[PDB]
Write a protein that binds this ligand. Structure first.
Ligand code: CLA
Ligand code: CLA
Ligand code: CLA
Ligand code: CLA
Ligand code: CLA
Ligand code: CLA
Ligand code: CLA
Ligand code: CLA
Ligand code: KC1
Ligand SMILES: CC1=C(/C=C/C(C)=C/C=C/C(C)=C/C=C/C=C(C)/C=C/C=C(C)/C=C/C2=C(C)CCCC2(C)C)C(C)(C)CCC1
Lengths: 165, 253, 160, 168, 160
């Protein structure tokens, strides 16, 4: 079984390593597979950011919350989050909701690339053979691979904590 | 090739070194290289040395020649010609599409993406250049969906929305960080100051509409600057409304 | 489904109740898969029940943090508890990698049993089929044998 | 095109691993057979050295030896080399084996082409092509890996004593 | 859609909150699949409550290692914490395999509730509608009875 051509060699152990061992790709229209890639990339970007936030919270770089709590916040990111007031947590929820609204109602993502919330596909050309420094597919694969790795890494951090301390 | 670049002994220059020198030198440059070029010194040593010419040279002159001539690898390696060809193709392409670097830690770090810096409509326009901050779909649909540009909005709606935003913002820096900070009426004084700032900037906008008459928002017919003046008046109204709402949310909760 | 593996000297049609439709090509391919897998796992299990008692258990620690010298762990069954959950998790992750590295979805070359472990890498000779048949026969024998050994040490202490 | 020798092959990430940064193959292609012979001999000796780090910890061999502290392998060399003893005999045996290597190659390494480098008589290559390739690449990989490993042991289980299979 | 198996007789096309206006088909198809599956599970669970009440708790030991005579597990809510987490995992695995079997993907034969039981395949005697509609109506009734039963089990405190 080969890639559904809308993903088209965009992941796996190698770039052309269509890996689905569950039939989550078959008999699915291109819009649904684009949705799957958009969800994967959003989950990734969120993870990749969350891992950095975790490691900068677990390394003592926990200002803005050092001041809010008016005392040194916990290095454990879960306990640090629990220390935050509900006002701050709901401000974070509201800001993420506003961001999600931005990329749906006023700034909808491109139809053929829903993961391109910034709409970067309107200013970049493509990877072409005339370009000696063409790396756009390479950086897309870097983003995807670090996304897939951080998606399991952040879960490792979260479930490792709150169950082992 | 040229007669003097034939059967050159390896001592003067390597065969690979000679090939690299020729590759990195323009074809029309031959037969008369400039005094500061590598090919000129290579030519000068190509004669007077080799075949029937002088086959020996003093040690000091040998050191001079070795200092003044390339040594193939790491100086005229095929990778260096590949990099020079890549650089010239890059500079050819940037007249067109430009690779995107970002200055990270003060040094430009290549990202991997190449921009469309060339303007879409007017090639020589200085403000039609394309950047992701100003030409990506997010920018187009973000600035385009703001009250100042959103489609379907009457001028009063744009004014009201911008005013509400400005008024709700302006109450902030006055209630705290002000003369009457640690007072029960800090919120009220901040509200009064925010309303004053909204009124002053609205008078300034009225002044702009009376003098410049921007005409960018006027409907058909009407008068020059009518749309902008309506926008500024409803900005004043919205500023009062947003400032009052911020003061309400401060007094409550 | 005639000339594959199971055919041998004493039997080769042994199926009192299987072949439910006598067809279901996909079912038989899946069944040959489970055959090769269960066979390999049973052989490794029988060796791991066979190498300890004769040529006695390894010398070492197996967990220098928790001091669990290879020998003191009980031979059969009971080892499921004393070996640390860290080591068991590492065993499980090795198994998960070994299964999910090559695609197990039916149709693939790894589906039918070839996992790319070509140690002898028989270059498609006549030896190929006889090696396959020996593997599957010892697999069936090992499945029977390990069920017997698991029953035995479930009813009488250690492996014997 | 490549080094000509087997090398590489059966590499991770698919494809082949032509790894040669300094380019000893390209810069000195005449000594490529010498490099292959050195690599194979070093790998075989390193694998035997790993076996000689492990097995003496277990069995300790017949004859006098049999002691206990004479297995530290940071010490064992000196005893059997002192008194013109077993280490000297092993040196003579290795010299004889490589004299046989000289004779097969033809003295002065006047042979050593890119098919007999390491061939060293003894065991017989499998005539099947894919077997041969997999088995040769297995020897080469195990060789290099044991070279790096045995080096790691002879540094680590020297700075921190250890001197037993955990080495940590 | 106004003629499917759901419309029995006592109520016609009963869609009070208008989930059918501009019938999205695929939406209705998957909602019918959900209705069939929920009804089947509700029937099974209503059995799983009313049968252990009259018929005694299983003669057996449930978990051979942790002393569950089925009598310390009460019938109703609270048995979620009484049945072993491993037993819950295993029943979860059974259901997961039963679904991860033959696909119920949109358009597949599993997407209309058909799975391959065929316990009552009346020989097309104008009765395929009888059994289908009876299953659907009993599914609705069993889901409502289950909701009432769970409310009685929790509200009152135990069982009924
Ligand atoms: C999924 C992404 C994610 C999420 C949910 C959080 C969530 C949180 N971070 Mg955080 N962080 C992240 C990524 C993330 N971070 C990254 C990538 C960095 C590196 C720049 C940081 C650096 C950072 C610092 C230095 C601090 C937090 C803090 C906090 C907590 C209070 C919220 C706050 O003030 O944020 C502030 C966040 C920023 C200033 C960084 C914004 C960068 C975003 C992710 C780019 C988009 C909250 C639990 C603060 C705290 O008190 O923790 C308890 C705190 O001191 N984070
Ligand atoms: C520097 C002081 C200052 C100035 C120049 C203005 C200027 C203006 N105000 Mg104003 N205002 C101010 C302070 C000021 N305001 C303060 C402190 C308050 C709170 C009492 C208000 C409450 C206020 C109201 C309630 C209204 C204005 C309105 C107006 C506009 C007529 C004009 C733009 C009117 C308006 O919206 O014009 C469009 C209007 O209805 N102002
Ligand atoms: C939704 C409309 C609304 C509501 C419910 C309130 C409610 C209130 N205002 Mg208020 N206010 C509003 C809009 C509103 N404001 C606007 C738009 C303005 C700008 C003109 C003001 C200017 C204003 C002043 C200047 C004062 C109030 C005050 C008050 C309080 C009496 C009460 C909490 C008084 C206060 O501070 O009470 C604590 C007070 O002195 N308001
Ligand atoms: C005694 C050490 C030794 C020697 C003589 C060789 C010799 C060789 N290796 Mg090799 N190798 C070694 C150790 C060694 N290897 C180790 C430890 C590793 C693991 C990183 C490798 C990994 C490796 C790969 C992945 C490949 C080779 C290849 C080769 C062959 C061509 C490259 C070459 O000329 O390198 C000679 C290098 C030296 C003589 C340097 C000596 C060590 C310096 C002084 C430090 C050549 C026969 C290539 C090959 O066989 O392709 C056909 C190839 O693809 N080697
Ligand atoms: C197969 C290759 C290999 C592997 C798996 C390890 C594995 C390890 N080494 Mg190591 N090492 C190796 C080769 C290897 N080494 C080589 C070739 C050298 C020579 C430079 C060393 C020198 C070395 C030192 C000096 C140290 C390690 C240490 C360690 C441990 C951390 C870990 C068990 C550390 C340790 O504590 O080991 C005792 C340590 O400090 N290694
Ligand atoms: C989740 C279960 C479920 C589902 C998916 C359906 C689905 C369907 N039913 Mg159906 N039905 C159900 C339960 C369900 N039913 C029950 C319990 C009864 C008995 C009251 C009925 C009685 C019934 C009749 C009489 C008819 C249908 C029909 C239909 C079809 C069209 C209506 C529609 O779009 O519903 C979409 C699905 C829903 C609206 C389900 C949402 C239920 C909400 C979320 C909860 C309702 C309140 C609930 C009790 C709250 C409990 C507390 C909870 C919050 C914890 C559709 C296939 C019609 C049909 O077959 O036409 C061809 C028809 O005539 N149903
Ligand atoms: C009111 C009780 C009731 C009734 C009338 C039916 C009636 C039916 N069931 Mg059903 N079922 C019930 C309870 C009931 N079931 C319960 C409690 C469960 C849970 C175990 C199931 C689980 C179940 C499955 C899993 C399947 C059926 C199937 C069928 C259909 C038989 C095949 C057929 O005629 O397809 C036409 C010939 C038939 C409509 C089968 C079906 O619809 O497709 C074959 C099927 O696959 N049922
Ligand atoms: C056809 C279904 C059905 C039937 C026959 C009953 C039958 C009964 N209910 Mg009931 N109930 C049901 C569904 C049903 N319930 C559902 C779906 C709910 C959730 C909304 C309830 C919620 C409910 C409450 C809250 C109470 C009853 C009570 C009662 C009893 C009077 C009687 C035994 C009463 C009772 O027995 O008291 C504990 C009572 O107070 N019921
Ligand atoms: C931390 C030090 C380090 C170790 C310890 C290590 C180990 C191995 N490397 Mg590796 N390596 C780097 C460092 C290290 N590598 C770096 C910095 C780079 C970027 C230049 C790099 C690249 C490649 C490539 C391209 C290949 C490769 C190989 C193997 C291999 C063979 C396994 C097998 O084939 O038997 C082993 C054991 C091949 C392979 O893919 O292995 C998966 C191969 O083709 N490596
Ligand atoms: C943070 C952040 C950000 C953002 C920022 C901003 C921009 C903010 C703002 C905010 C705001 C700025 C908000 C606002 C709001 C407002 C409001 C909320 C208002 C309201 C009002 C009202 C409601 C009014 C009413 C009225 C009227 C209309 C008139 C009459 C009177 C009354 C009162 C009735 C970004 C993304 C950059 C990035 C980083 C992060």
């Amino acid at each position: 079984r080969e890639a559904p051509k809308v993903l088209a060699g965009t992941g796996g152990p190698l770039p052309e390593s269509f890996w689905d061992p569950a039939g989550f790709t078959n008999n699915k229209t291109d819009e649904e597979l684009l949705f799957y890639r958009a969800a994967e990339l959003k989950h990734g970007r969120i993870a990749m950011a969350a891992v950095v936030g975790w490691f900068t919270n677990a390394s003592g770089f926990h200002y803005l919350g050092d001041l809010w709590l008016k005392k040194p916040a916990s290095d454990n990111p879960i306990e640090a989050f629990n220390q935050l007031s509900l006002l701050g947590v709901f401000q974070m929820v509201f800001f993420i909701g506003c961001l999600e609204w931005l990329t749906t109602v006023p700034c909808p993502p491109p139809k053929d690339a829903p993961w391109d919330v910034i709409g970067m596909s309107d200013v970049l050309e493509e990877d072409t053979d005339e370009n000696p420094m063409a790396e756009y597919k390479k950086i897309q694969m870097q983003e995807l691979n670090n996304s897939r790795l951080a998606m399991v890494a952040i879960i490792g951090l979260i479930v490792q904590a709150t169950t082992t301390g | 090739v040229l007669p003097y670049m034939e059967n050159i002994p390896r001592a003067i220059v390597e065969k690979e070194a000679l090939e690299g020198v020729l590759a990195m030198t323009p074809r029309e440059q031959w037969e008369d290289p400039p005094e500061d070029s590598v090919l000129y010194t290579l030519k000068v040593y190509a004669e007077t040395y080799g075949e029937g010419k002088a086959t020996k040279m003093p040690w000091w002159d040998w050191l001079y020649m070795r200092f003044e001539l390339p040594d193939a690898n790491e100086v005229s390696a095929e990778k260096i010609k590949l990099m020079e060809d890549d650089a010239k193709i890059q500079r050819r392409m940037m007249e067109g599409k430009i690779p995107l670097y970002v200055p990270i830690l003060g040094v430009p770090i290549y990202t991997g993406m190449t921009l469309d810096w060339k303007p879409e409509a007017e090639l020589f326009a200085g403000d039609q250049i394309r950047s992701p901050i100003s030409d990506s779909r997010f920018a187009k649909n973000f600035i385009g969906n703001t009250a100042f540009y959103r489609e379907g909005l009457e001028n009063w709606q744009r004014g009201l929305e911008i005013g509400m935003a400005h008024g709700y913002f302006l109450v902030g820096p006055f209630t705290t960080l002000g003369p009457l900070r640690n007072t029960p009426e800090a919120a009220t004084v901040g509200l009064l100051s925010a309303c004053a700032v909204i009124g002053i900037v609205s008078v300034g906008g009225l002044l702009f509409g009376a003098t410049v008459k921007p005409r960018a928002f006027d409907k058909d017919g009407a008068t020059a600057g009518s749309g902008f003046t309506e926008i500024i008046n409803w900005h004043a109204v919205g500023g009062l409304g947003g400032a009052g709402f911020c003061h309400l949310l401060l007094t409550l909760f | 489904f005639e000339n594959e593996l199971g055919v041998q000297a004493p039997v080769g049609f042994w199926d009192p109740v299987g072949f439910t439709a006598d067809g279901n090509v996909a079912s038989f391919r899946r069944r040959r898969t489970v055959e090769l897998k269960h066979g390999r796992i049973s052989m490794l299990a029988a060796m791991g029940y066979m190498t300890p008692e004769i040529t006695g258990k390894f010398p070492g620690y197996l967990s220098p943090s928790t001091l669990l010298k290879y020998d003191d762990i009980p031979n059969g069954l009971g080892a499921i508890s004393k070996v640390p959950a860290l080591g068991w998790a590492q065993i499980f992750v090795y198994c998960g990698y070994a299964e999910l590295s090559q695609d197990q979805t039916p149709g693939s070359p790894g589906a039918e049993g070839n996992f790319g472990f070509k140690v002898l890498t028989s270059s498609d000779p006549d030896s190929l089929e006889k090696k396959l048949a020996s593997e599957i026969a010892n697999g069936r024998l090992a499945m029977m044998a390990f069920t017997g050994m698991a029953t035995q040490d479930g009813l009488t202490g250690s492996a014997w | 095109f490549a080094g000509g020798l087997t090398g590489s092959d059966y590499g991770g990430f698919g494809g082949k691993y032509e790894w040669d940064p300094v380019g000893f193959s390209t810069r000195w292609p005449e000594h490529l057979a010498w490099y292959r012979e050195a690599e194979l001999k070093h790998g075989r000796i390193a694998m035997l050295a790993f076996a000689g780090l492990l097995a003496p910890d277990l069995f300790r061999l017949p004859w006098a030896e049999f002691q206990d502290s004479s297995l530290d392998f940071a010490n064992a060399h000196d005893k059997f080399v002192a008194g013109f003893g077993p280490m000297w005999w092993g040196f003579i045996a290795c010299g004889g084996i490589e004299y046989q290597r000289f004779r097969k190659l033809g003295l002065g390494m006047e042979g050593l082409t890119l098919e007999n480098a390491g061939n060293l008589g003894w065991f017989d290559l499998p005539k099947n092509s894919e077997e041969r390739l997999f088995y040769e690449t297995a020897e080469l990989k195990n060789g290099r890996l044991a070279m790096l490993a045995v080096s790691g042991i002879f540094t680590a289980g020297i700075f921190w004593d250890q001197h037993h299979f955990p080495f940590i």
